[PDB]
Request: fold
Amino acid sequence: MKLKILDKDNATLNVFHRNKEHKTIDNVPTANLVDWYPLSNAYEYKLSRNGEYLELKRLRSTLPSSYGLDDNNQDIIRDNNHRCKIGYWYNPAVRKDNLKIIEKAKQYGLPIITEEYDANTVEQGFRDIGVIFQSLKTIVVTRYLEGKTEEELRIFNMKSEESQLNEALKESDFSVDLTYSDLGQIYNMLLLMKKIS
Amino acid sequence: MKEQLEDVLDTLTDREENVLRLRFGLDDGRTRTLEEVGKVFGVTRERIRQIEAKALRKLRH
Reply:
């Protein structure tokens, strides 16, 4: 799925159709983008068989299950309250979960796509979310090094940070990937805000 | 290379442009590890490395 924001009056969307056929929807609205566009990373839009609907598709991912779609269930995918219509861009479900995300971003103190913003606000947004990520891994290792008891020393602390984070997240809490998922979707929001400037 | 990336990422799906972007930290400024990016997109590190191997190789032909 490829959202190409052209001149800031509209956009174009590249999606799959049938068995990996290429289709593009022009005249895609960029205002009220919150409604229909999924911020998940675990889902993507696909042109319906009779192409007048954009319907969800669950991607291979260990991310949480948003939009009520857990496994590409056709009875949910074809439902009108779980898919968008080309022309009247609702969602829906997508709007609910995305509003929840925009609530999370509000909690963190990050600029949201619902209210006014410029390039500066978005730049500050990414700059802050970076701090959030760094702090998150820092805490994920901090509250992890309590077992020890002195096994750390200068043997464990050997390279690398990738290895350290791997061994630390290996037995980390289950909520960590939920928070990471939230931050991912928020990141996608900030990205949408960035490309809209 | 900074100007070529913004066109090379426009030839990739959004979900790949975003893993490369998060990893290399374009707008983020800072750099994200393979594990962090893998956690953000819910996929293993090897896969992310495959995306990198697909994108960085596109800067040739």
Summary: Residues 43 and 58 of chain A are 5 Å apart (CA to CA).
